[PDB]
Amino acid sequence: DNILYSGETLSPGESLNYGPYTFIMQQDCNLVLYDVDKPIWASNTGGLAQGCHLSMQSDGNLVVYSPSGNRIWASNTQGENGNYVCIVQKDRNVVIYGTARWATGTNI
Amino acid sequence: DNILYSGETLSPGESLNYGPYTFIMQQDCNLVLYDVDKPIWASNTGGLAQGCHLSMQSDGNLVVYSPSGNRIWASNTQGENGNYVCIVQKDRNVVIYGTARWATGTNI
Amino acid sequence: DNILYSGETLSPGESLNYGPYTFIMQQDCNLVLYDVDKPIWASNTGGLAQGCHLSMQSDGNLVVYSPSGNRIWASNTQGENGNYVCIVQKDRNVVIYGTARWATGTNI
Amino acid sequence: DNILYSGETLSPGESLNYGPYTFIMQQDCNLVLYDVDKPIWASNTGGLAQGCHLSMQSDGNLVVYSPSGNRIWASNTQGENGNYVCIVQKDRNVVIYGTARWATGTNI
Ligand SMILES: OC[C@H]1O[C@@H](O)[C@@H](O)[C@@H](O)[C@@H]1O
Ligand SMILES: OC[C@H]1O[C@@H](O)[C@@H](O)[C@@H](O)[C@@H]1O
Ligand SMILES: OC[C@H]1O[C@@H](O)[C@@H](O)[C@@H](O)[C@@H]1O
Ligand SMILES: OC[C@H]1O[C@@H](O)[C@@H](O)[C@@H](O)[C@@H]1O
């Protein structure tokens, strides 16, 4: 609910949430962080397309894609292939972390 | 509740939780991942001391310390100084990620 | 979280949250349910005072109080004395339930 | 999550969770509240059947049913037809509340 894992996408209208904080891939292709109803950060890509999705990729890049498979905005954080996370944190920061350094190996 | 940030500690009896998954720093100094009442992973340090704390450090090492400030168990993942997270994931894996590659910079 | 128990208050600026839904006791004494940035319900008491708190009472009434201990808005649901909950639900309804009909009695 | 709404069921192996607290409809038809790995309350119906479901009914009764549609255990809280909730609370109590006294009417 507040974590996007590498290999997952937010569809249009979908969000990560922590308390009053919402990080949403809007239908107007703007990527916005709201504190209640106040925009605090945006990709500033509102109106460049419709029906965009947000991908957290295996190369560590967070990308807004238009439905033509066309890059609209990116974090520009391509690097090592592996596992990454994008988190809406309790401190209201949105952060990409990776690669994975250690695991219990208890996945299902 | 399912994330430990670098610079934070779990005190004795404290846990990270996702649904039926509990990752707990026990009073007997064992670090255990439970699926409901079933231990699925442990540090196997039960009885080596009392009143241990778990630290997620800035160097990326997850360490169980005894109250004498003495290292009892570690992930052995020291590297670059920065920001890391330890997550109890929805897939029941416990994972350390870092360093931070990008942020909105919207922290309070 | 998404539950206010009878005997608790939301202070000014505090909220109940479920995913993109935020139920906030605003600084301007308006009680508002937001879906992301869109107000979908309000007490319509914005500007009648400053520094109001929301109280879920053991008589089952949800009341906005001004700092003079003065009733500004209420659900008008006074009844049996007991335990009640106010919930921001997954279906985006905000509901008062009570009284308590049964419990395990496993409270701390 | 930590709420079961009237009209919903927990299937075998499914749980309500708050932090280290797990309320599970087990495969062995026992209904158990665990604090980490410690059972603190049970229906004591382990082994009376297999593949039971827990149902929070609109008559306010919480019932364990066997797959033959047969009552195995109940809270015995039948009353007014309406909307009820069963909650695993932050205080580690499991409580049934209802009926609904008030709502915003903002459901989807
Ligand atoms: O090695 C760690 C990785 O293991 C995978 O199976 C998943 O659980 C990933 O989320 C995780 O990053
Ligand atoms: O640069 C990213 C870092 O910024 C800090 O202020 C915190 O929000 C950290 O959790 C985060 O890793
Ligand atoms: O008996 C039910 C009541 O028990 C109390 O001690 C608390 O746990 C209340 O939240 C609950 O409604
Ligand atoms: O009127 C109250 C009821 O409204 C219904 O439509 C649902 O949202 C129920 O969960 C709720 O109890």
| A59 Cα: distance to centroid of ligand 1 (angstroms) | 14
Task: Report in angstroms the alpha-carbon separations of B40 from A108, B45, B55, D78.
Answer: 11, 15, 21, 40
Judge residue C47's burial from the number of C-beta atoms within 10 Å of its C-beta, 0-12 exposed, 13-18 middle, 19 or more buried. Answer: exposed
Q: Which ligand is nearest to the CA of D82?
A: 4
Gaps in chain D with C–N over 2.5 Å, residue before each: none
Q: Is the beta carbon of D93 within 6 A of some atom in ligand 3? A: yes
Report the C-alpha dihedral over residues A31, A33, A39, A44, rounded to 10 degrees.
Answer: -30
Q: Which residues of B touch D24 (CB under 8 A)?
A: 20, 36
> In this structure, are strands D15-18 and A84-88 parallel, antiparallel, or unpaired?
unpaired
Read off the DSSP letter of residue B44.
Answer: S
DSSP D5-46: ETT-EEPTT-EEEETTEEEEE-TTS-EEEEETTEEEEE---T
In the numeric block, the tokens 């309790």 are attached to A90
The C-alpha atoms of residue B47 and residue D12 are separated, in whole angstroms, by 35
Two structure tokens written together for A1: 């609910």
Contact between A83 and A58 (Cβ < 8 Å): yes
Partners of B62 on chain A (C-beta within 8 Å) are 102
Number of residues written out for chain D:
108
Which of B46, B26, D92, D106 shows the shortest CA–CA distance to C88?
A: D106
- Ligand 1 pocket member B91 (CB < 6 A): yes
CA distance C90 to B92: 24
| Structural biology method used | X-ray
* CB-based burial, D73-102: b 16+ in 10 Å, e otherwise: bbbebeeeeebbbbbbbeebbbbbbbbbbb
Contact between A103 and A86 under an 8 Å Cβ cutoff? The reply is no
Residues of chain B with C-beta less than 8 angstroms from the C-beta of A33? 104, 106
Measured CA to CA, the distance from residue A85 to residue B100 in angstroms comes to 10
What is the 8-class DSSP label of residue B26?
-
Among A43, A6, A49, which residue's Cα sits nearest to residue A23? A43
Which protein residues are within 6 Å of ligand 2, measured from CB? A 89, 91, 93, 95; B 5, 83, 100, 103, 107
| Ligand 4 atom nearest D6 alpha carbon | 10
- Rounded to an integer, what distance in angstroms lies between the CA atom of residue B5 and that of residue A95? 12
- Taking the CA atoms of residue A23, residue A25, residue A28 and residue A30 in that order, the dihedral angle to the nearest 10 degrees is 60
Whether A5 lines ligand 1, by a CB cut-off of 6 Å, is yes
Instruction: Report the atom number in ligand 2 closest to the C-alpha of B82.
Output: 12
Whether ligand 1 lies within 6 angstroms of the CB of B95 is answered as yes
Distance from CA of A40 to the nearest CA of C (A): 12
Q: Which residue is closest in CA terms to ligand 1's atom 9?
A: A83
Using CA atoms, how far residue B84 sits from A75, A104, B5, B6, B95, in Å, is 19, 16, 6, 5, 10
Strand arrangement of the beta sheet that strand B21-25 belongs to: B15-18, B21-25, B31-35, B38-42
Place of tokens 């009695």: C105
**DSSP-assigned letter for residue C98:** E
D104 preceded by a cis bond (ω within 30 of 0): no
Which pair of tokens denotes residue D17?
């969770």
In chain B, what are the domain boundaries? 1-108
Q: Tokens 């607290």: give the residue.
A: D21
Cα separation, B102 vs A62, whole angstroms: 9
Sorted by sequence, the CB contacts under 8 Å of residue B104 that are 6+ apart come out as A33, A40, A41, A93, A94, A95
